[PDB]
Structures are given as C-alpha cells and as structure tokens.
Chains A and B, each alone.
Chain A
C-alpha cells in the first residue's frame, strides 16, 4: 500500500528507538514533582517521529493500516490466507 508509506513507517521506527526509550527518560523522570524550570517540557524539539505513538502497526506483508492483528503481525486478509494454507502453526477453524 503505497511504498512511500511503508518507508515512512520504517523512518518512524528508526527514530523511535534512536532518540526515545533513551530521552523519553525526560518525560518520565523530569516531568515530575521534584522542583521548577520550564526547560525539559521545551526539550521536546526531538524530531516528533521519535514519538512511539506515531507508529501505525501496518501489515507486515502488505502494509495495510486497518485490520491489523498484533499477535500475527498481519492484516486480517493475510491472516486468513496464511491460516488456511497452514503456515500459521496451531491455528485452525474454531467452533464451540
């Protein structure tokens, strides 16, 4: 789904684990009941795609944004296709 969008997604992940989880430290530790200075609330001139709330969780194969399933990492369409062929282990039809 539009190569550009998948490339954009990889950009957001790479910035997400470069800056944040290392300087997202700020928003967890210094924005707190400690002193204060306005400074670390203004030290969010980090490139806005380091934010991990900007990944979409696209389908791993087709990049489809909607219908994602976090367990399999795929959209519902590729979950069904692969589920029926037998590449998803353990998964089968359900009836109860």
Chain B
C-alpha cells in the first residue's frame, strides 16, 4: 500500500477544499461532524441524481451547501420543491439557517466521482468489468482528458481470488504537483463482496 491520495497532495497547489469555513477549536469538531451528517444525508438522498461534489461553507452562522451534480433537473425537480425540502432537512441537521445551490457538472464523463459511480453501478448490475472500464476510458478520452486511468480491484467476475486489472490511456502524471488530476473512488457492493473502483482523470498541466 503505497501511493498518496492525489487530491490531498494538491490541496494548496491546484485543488480546492470541499469545506471552506473558518472555526476556532471550540466548534471545529462540531462543524466538522455537522458536515459529515449533511454529506452523509445529502449523498444518500441524491443517489440517483449523479452527484459529484458537495461543498460546505459557513458564512456567519449559516450553511451554504453547493451540490456539484450532473443532472441538476432531477435535483431541483418540477418547481423546486425538492431543493426547499433538502434545505429544510439540512437546516434540521446543521441547526443553522441553510442555503443550498446547484452547480451543473457538464461533461459528466470527465468527473471521477461520476465515472467511479458509473462503473460501480454497472458492476452491481452484473455486467462484465472489462466493458465498464474500457467504455469509461474510451468515452472519457473522447472529450478532452489528457489522461485517464481506471482501476477496479477485488474478486472481479465472482472469482475466488482477487485481481486488479487497471487500464489507462493518455498521460496521467501523478508525481507532478501542478497536474490537475481529478481522482475519486467508489465501492461496488456485489453479491460476491466489495469491488473497489478508483479513477484518475488528468485534465491539464496547471
């Protein structure tokens, strides 16, 4: 087990943080756990909506949750009853007056959360993994994407030993720190157990 998380080593360099509140030591743990609850809830209740990121920020006793998603229409719905329902329950969880926004992730096959969730969904619909991976690399390289690597792992095809079998195309410069590597990871709970899907997407060199 030996590679650094390629989001974490780029946190001040190119990648931003998904939480951008300041807090002293008295409320740092409380704000942090409140963020675990709103991302847990808001991740479970938008499983069909293809959600990429949820960014929390707290401007002066009020949360401001931004849902980067690929299907904004299914998040908002017929006149946005679903949004006001979500800020009602996020205001229930965080205990502050909640705002909520939706940022449309166009080009959803270049986002690693959406790619890993895609391949994970296909693996738990019992399709063969080489199609899922290989289709994901092809259609991601089709639109921009100066590199992509996907990597499934663990008891693939229902075996009794676990393999990995990664694929990559293009250039994925993972030790370069100015590389805009969009990396994310999902787990596929199949009837044989968990299958881990990692995906790195190299977008640009700065």
Residues in A whose Cβ lies below 8 Å from that of B36: 60-61, 82, 87
A89 and B22 form a contact (CB under 8 A): yes
B25 and A85 form a contact (CB under 8 A): no
Residues in A whose Cβ lies below 8 Å from that of B19: 86-89
A86 and B29 form a contact (CB under 8 A): no
B33 within 8 Å of A by Cβ?
Answer: yes
Interface residues of A in 77-96 (CB under 8 A from B): 82-90, 92-93
Which range contains the number of A residues in contact with the other chain?
10 to 19
**Binary contact track A49-93/B, C-beta < 8 Å → 1, others 0:** 000000000001100000000111110000000111111111011
**Which partner residue on chain A sits nearest B11 by CB separation?**
A92
Residues in A whose Cβ lies below 8 Å from that of B18: 85-87
Asked, given contacts A89-B17, A89-B20, whether A84 binds B29 with beta carbons under 8 Å apart, the answer is no
Residues in A whose Cβ lies below 8 Å from that of B28: 71-73
Q: Name 7 A/B residue pairs within 8 A (Cβ), A-sorted.
A: A82-B36, A84-B5, A85-B7, A86-B7, A87-B32, A88-B32, A89-B20
Interface residues of A (CB under 8 A from B): 60-61, 70-74, 82-90, 92-93
Apart from A73-B33, A84-B5, A86-B17, list 17 A-B contacts with CB within 8 A. A60-B29, A61-B33, A70-B29, A72-B28, A72-B29, A73-B29, A85-B5, A85-B8, A86-B8, A86-B15, A86-B16, A87-B19, A87-B35, A87-B36, A87-B39, A87-B56, A92-B8
